Design an enzyme around this catalytic site. Structure first.
Site, PDB file in Angstrom:
ATOM      1  N   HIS A 131      -5.110  -7.633   0.943  1.00  0.00           N
ATOM      2  CA  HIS A 131      -4.222  -6.492   1.153  1.00  0.00           C
ATOM      3  C   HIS A 131      -3.177  -6.741   2.236  1.00  0.00           C
ATOM      4  O   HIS A 131      -2.214  -5.991   2.343  1.00  0.00           O
ATOM      5  CB  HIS A 131      -5.052  -5.257   1.514  1.00  0.00           C
ATOM      6  CG  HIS A 131      -4.390  -3.949   1.189  1.00  0.00           C
ATOM      7  ND1 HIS A 131      -3.862  -3.660  -0.050  1.00  0.00           N
ATOM      8  CD2 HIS A 131      -4.206  -2.840   1.948  1.00  0.00           C
ATOM      9  CE1 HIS A 131      -3.366  -2.431  -0.039  1.00  0.00           C
ATOM     10  NE2 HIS A 131      -3.569  -1.913   1.158  1.00  0.00           N
ATOM     11  N   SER A 187       0.844  -1.200   0.000  1.00  0.00           N
ATOM     12  CA  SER A 187       0.000   0.000   0.000  1.00  0.00           C
ATOM     13  C   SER A 187       0.884   1.256   0.000  1.00  0.00           C
ATOM     14  O   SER A 187       1.745   1.382  -0.851  1.00  0.00           O
ATOM     15  CB  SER A 187      -0.964  -0.018   1.192  1.00  0.00           C
ATOM     16  OG  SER A 187      -2.178   0.644   0.860  1.00  0.00           O
ATOM     17  N   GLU A 204       0.355  -4.295  -3.894  1.00  0.00           N
ATOM     18  CA  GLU A 204      -0.860  -3.471  -3.979  1.00  0.00           C
ATOM     19  C   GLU A 204      -0.602  -1.985  -3.731  1.00  0.00           C
ATOM     20  O   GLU A 204      -0.951  -1.415  -2.685  1.00  0.00           O
ATOM     21  CB  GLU A 204      -1.937  -4.034  -3.031  1.00  0.00           C
ATOM     22  CG  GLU A 204      -2.354  -5.462  -3.486  1.00  0.00           C
ATOM     23  CD  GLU A 204      -3.670  -5.945  -2.899  1.00  0.00           C
ATOM     24  OE1 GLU A 204      -4.156  -5.385  -1.887  1.00  0.00           O
ATOM     25  OE2 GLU A 204      -4.214  -6.924  -3.448  1.00  0.00           O
ATOM     26  N   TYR A 237      -3.155  10.551   4.489  1.00  0.00           N
ATOM     27  CA  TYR A 237      -2.681   9.643   3.447  1.00  0.00           C
ATOM     28  C   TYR A 237      -3.489   9.642   2.134  1.00  0.00           C
ATOM     29  O   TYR A 237      -2.911   9.884   1.077  1.00  0.00           O
ATOM     30  CB  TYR A 237      -2.599   8.212   4.017  1.00  0.00           C
ATOM     31  CG  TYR A 237      -1.332   7.929   4.804  1.00  0.00           C
ATOM     32  CD1 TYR A 237      -1.034   8.630   5.972  1.00  0.00           C
ATOM     33  CD2 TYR A 237      -0.443   6.936   4.395  1.00  0.00           C
ATOM     34  CE1 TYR A 237       0.133   8.360   6.701  1.00  0.00           C
ATOM     35  CE2 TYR A 237       0.715   6.669   5.112  1.00  0.00           C
ATOM     36  CZ  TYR A 237       1.003   7.384   6.256  1.00  0.00           C
ATOM     37  OH  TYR A 237       2.161   7.111   6.959  1.00  0.00           O
TER      38      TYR A 237
END
Ligand SMILES: C[C@H](O)CCCC(=O)CCC/C=C/c1cc(O)cc(O)c1
Ligand SMILES: C[C@H](O)CCCC(=O)CCC/C=C/c1cc(O)cc(O)c1
Ligand SMILES: [K+]
Ligand SMILES: [K+]
EC number: 3.1.1.-
Lengths: 267, 268
Positions: B241, B101, B125, B186
């Site tokens: 994830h 991420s 990812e 973020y």
């Protein structure tokens, strides 16, 4: 909507449907071979100025009057030959084609093997890998195959269970009979016949490739890689393995816009 | 296992963990910044002859004592600079790095920006698209954000509800506090900072890219396309994830094997 039958000299009596006038668009079913899945979209597509043709696949549903060869040890190349035979019978000289699953393998085989006949092909979720859990159903009894696969379709890959159920009792009765035919004839032979082994053969071709947005990444990961390597247009449709069932309006729009794009380019 | 803290001259007091001896492998957390998610895998990886280091990210969990700049308007490039600072502090000169991420964006930025420091990077990812539904949480009340995102993590992207919940009350209590920090800092600035816009810059780099096998195709479709265009190794891990949570043994094996591949190639 014309709903009729036509016999080809390879021994198949096809059930087919046709609507509209204009350039030809042909909708090839997935492995279950059931063209009622396109019913809503056929009308929407035809209304945009196209002649739309679809049909049950050999040995499936209403096209069951066919020799055993046509629904056993099935390959993309066999299916492509069969689709050419009904296009010949219906005097469809040049066609845009859509196909999902074994139908995707079929339309890529059509584009590569019969380029004069195919304006452009849309392929969706093309199987290139043997899956032992599917292949293993081929040795079970009919009733168990039908129960297993009907549940897989409904709960795992339909992309819309409500839409799937709404196909209706008559469709699901036909599908019930198709599942063992598909199980015995398709999963062990369709993936190794995938016409995507030669990436350079795909390059520059009028091919538009899709995968379901909600499909688990692992299922057709390889499609995305292959299309990208070949520089082929690759994108997503909503749902999973049956966008023409789960999202028929989006599906119809995609088929119309993609066909229009290639009509502009060819001119 | 060393469990300690260390302060860097950019004002961050880091919580970090370290285990093992041998070539350095560094596990960078995802956006939630919680390194207890690596606990099982740290030992498995270290046992194969590596020094494994991980840490909570700035402003998150145990690394919360940090200037506001380090957890607001966060970019891959900012995070890469922070990771270099703790690697400097720990005297880690050359490292294999993992990140998912925002951590994925971070390790690609590390590889490109500090090539002498990075043996190889594993990215999982990597977010390249703005998602309004995530960005919009930033204006909600803290408690509202934590409730919404706790549920999203469990039900949408964990890749394994039992394993996610089994992280336990201490971890989830820390995540609960992190969610508003992540939400405000973020999602609006991380995806535009994605260092994978320049495909030719990626070509030939020691990068191994993964996506979750169970992740809906649309989520990281763009990763597969980009990696393939750049000729970068691209493959799948089980789950979604958080493979280090859902499938820690497979995750550890992947990290070990990938690091071994690059150690072989490096000697070649
Ligand atoms: C609708 C579909 O054409 C027939 C039903 C099976 C199914 O949907 C499973 C998901 C997609 C797999 C297709 C597939 C997978 C194989 O390994 C071999 C093969 O011949 C076809
Ligand atoms: C664990 C993760 O780093 C933080 C929690 C959010 C989440 O898991 C949603 C799925 C993956 C999205 C990451 C993402 C998506 C964005 O639009 C912007 C961004 O900065 C990160
Ligand atoms: K629709
Ligand atoms: K595991």
């Amino acid at each position: 909507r014309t709903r009729s039958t036509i016999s080809t000299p390879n021994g198949i009596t096809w059930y087919y449907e046709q609507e509209g006038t204009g350039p030809d668009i042909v909708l090839v079913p997935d492995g279950l071979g059931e063209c009622q899945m396109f019913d809503s979209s056929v009308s929407q597509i035809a209304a945009q100025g196209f002649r739309v043709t679809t049909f049950d696949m050999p040995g499936m549903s209403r096209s069951a009057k066919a020799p055993a060869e046509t629904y056993t040890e099935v390959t993309a190349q066999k299916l492509a030959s069969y689709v050419i035979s009904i296009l010949d019978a219906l005097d469809i000289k040049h066609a845009t084609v859509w196909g999902c699953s074994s139908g995707a393998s079929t339309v890529v085989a059509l584009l590569l093997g019969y380029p004069d006949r195919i304006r452009n092909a849309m392929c969706h979720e093309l199987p290139t890998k043997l899956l032992d859990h599917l292949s293993n159903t081929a040795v079970l009894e009919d009733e168990e195959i039908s129960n297993i696969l009907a549940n897989v379709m409904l709960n795992d890959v339909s992309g819309g269970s409500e839409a799937w159920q709404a196909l209706g009792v008559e469709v699901h009765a036909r599908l019930h009979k198709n599942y063992p035919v598909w199980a015995r004839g398709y999963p062990r032979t369709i993936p190794p016949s995938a016409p995507v082994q030669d990436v350079e053969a795909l390059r520059g071709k009028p091919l538009d490739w899709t995968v379901g947005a909600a499909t688990p990444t692992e299922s057709f990961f390889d499609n995305i890689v292959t299309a990208t390597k070949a520089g082929v247009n690759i994108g997503l449709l909503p749902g999973m393995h049956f966008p023409y069932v789960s999202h028929p309006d989006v599906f119809a729009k995609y088929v119309v816009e993609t066909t229009q794009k290639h009509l502009w380019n060819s001119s």
